[PDB]
Design a protein around this ligand. Structure first.
Ligand SMILES: Nc1nc2c(ncn2[C@@H]2O[C@@H]3COP(=O)(O)O[C@H]4[C@@H](O)[C@H](n5cnc6c(=O)[nH]c(N)nc65)O[C@@H]4COP(=O)(O)O[C@H]3[C@H]2O)c(=O)[nH]1
Ligand SMILES: Nc1nc2c(ncn2[C@@H]2O[C@@H]3COP(=O)(O)O[C@H]4[C@@H](O)[C@H](n5cnc6c(=O)[nH]c(N)nc65)O[C@@H]4COP(=O)(O)O[C@H]3[C@H]2O)c(=O)[nH]1
Ligand SMILES: [Ca+2]
Ligand SMILES: [Ca+2]
Ligand SMILES: [Ca+2]
Ligand SMILES: [Ca+2]
Lengths: 237, 237
């Protein structure tokens, strides 16, 4: 209730090997399903802290109410807070109140539109890992979310940007990028997740290339205040 | 026609395989060897184009005056000139007047906060290639200069950011990043160039890993209005 209100949509992440849902990404929405950008547009510098806290409690509260028993992935605001130990208490308290294990919460980090801070994000990531949270680098291969992040700290998961996934079955350059990045992730013991999968052709190439966790319209669109079920076409095909 | 004046320093790029000097990067300086940042700090949106053009002509003219016979590498300003012949003619004319071959000029592209027009950088790169210029992605593995660029267009050279090079002989994560990136560059028929090499230990790992083109204080610092000679410690053969 920081001048405005909002809620969450949820989008499944699928394990294409086991054909089970690994979890859901929480995606901020307006009360009448207005887009995430229109909500985040209302966030200013005096909002960052309070807005980020509301996102986590809303996602946890909604996911618990909806009966989510797999992972809950929450986007971490790009700049926002410096100190990592203080006001995470409200996240820990919410997780306790809704009986949602910390180990089932993943935070997605996409650096910023800022310079070579990186040591800023690193200590946040390593502190969250120390409490039991899962961590992901988001939008890998776009913007400031790249190899510079990976060089200084490693998350549990790397979500590869949809720009690199698009039409990968037909794009030899994207094929070479992904094959070498998958070997990199394997060397670093990082689990890849392909984001923005829109067609069976992308899915099949990515699955053959070794990706298991995937997300995208091909599986299910984000669901307003709900947990969407997943497309049956991928599990048989 | 600019409010201020400046000149260039030059820093050699070495080929550790052929043991020859590949070329020199031109680095903008003030008339009294003031730093590049102090010069570029005076550039605003009403300056970007003209400043970028002056840098090119000054680098070409000085390199010619100093008798440069290898490649000349020139930085392209983030969000500089427009898509087509936006007076690249003045660059062609200067190269001709100073009898500097077009194929010996390389332009370095370092993106910084471009998200919208994707073919914007691509069309400049493909047009310059069509004129005979060499092209490089600069600072690969930092800022907005990452895998997203490589996916949609490929330059002749990729300069890997010094952040990825630093202490690589002792850094297992940076070794894996570089090993897998070197294989990617080879798959894309792109020549790698390791930037910011500061010690023999970094040089030795990079050479054993297959890197040929290198740049850094280990070889020579930039020389104000001069072409520095290269470190005798490696050049003894
Ligand atoms: N073209 C395409 N898009 C797909 C596909 N599958 C999922 N998406 C969309 O792509 C975005 C993925 O989330 P994001 O990359 O982190 O990009 C997000 C995220 O960076 C930001 N953000 C969203 N929710 C939150 C939040 O709760 N807290 C914070 N701090 N930031 C958020 O807003 C961005 C947009 O989120 P959305 O509008 O929901 O758009 C979502 C999602 O709806 C696909 O197959 N094709
Ligand atoms: N720590 C370390 N640094 C090394 C080493 N070897 C070279 N360098 C420094 O790192 C910078 C390399 O150039 P840059 O990455 O493109 O980064 C440059 C470039 O982006 C920008 N710039 C410089 N000259 C020009 C120009 O003529 N035109 C445009 N548009 N930008 C320029 O200014 C940036 C800084 O230029 P400089 O002050 O000359 O700093 C140079 C260079 O002096 C090393 O071994 N260790
Ligand atoms: Ca995300
Ligand atoms: Ca994302
Ligand atoms: Ca450069
Ligand atoms: Ca550079």
């Amino acid at each position: 209730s920081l001048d405005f209100d909002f809620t969450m949509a949820f989008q499944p992440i699928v394990n294409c090997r086991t054909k089970e849902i690994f979890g859901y990404e929480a995606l901020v929405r307006g009360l009448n399903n207005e887009s995430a950008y229109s909500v985040i547009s209302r966030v200013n510098e005096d909002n960052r802290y309070l807005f980020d806290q509301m996102c986590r409690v809303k996602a946890i509260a909604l996911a618990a109410k909806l009966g989510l028993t797999s992972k809950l992935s929450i986007n971490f605001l790009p700049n926002a807070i410096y100190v990592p130990e203080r006001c995470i208490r409200t996240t820990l308290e919410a997780a306790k109140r809704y009986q949602f294990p910390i180990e089932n919460i993943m935070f997605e980090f996409t650096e910023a539109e800022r310079v070579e801070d990186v040591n800023h994000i690193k200590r946040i990531v390593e502190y969250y890992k120390s409490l039991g949270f899962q961590t992901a680098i988001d939008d890998f291969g776009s913007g400031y979310s790249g190899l510079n992040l990976l060089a200084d700290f490693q998350t549990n998961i790397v979500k590869v940007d949809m720009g690199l996934i698009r039409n990968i079955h037909a794009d030899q350059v994207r094929q070479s990028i992904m094959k070498n990045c998958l070997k990199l992730f394997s060397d670093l013991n990082i689990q890849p997740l392909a984001e923005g999968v829109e067609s069976h052709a992308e899915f099949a190439w990515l699955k053959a290339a070794g990706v298991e966790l995937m997300q995208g319209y091909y599986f299910a669109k984000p669901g307003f205040e709900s947990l969407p079920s997943v497309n049956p076409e991928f599990s048989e095909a």
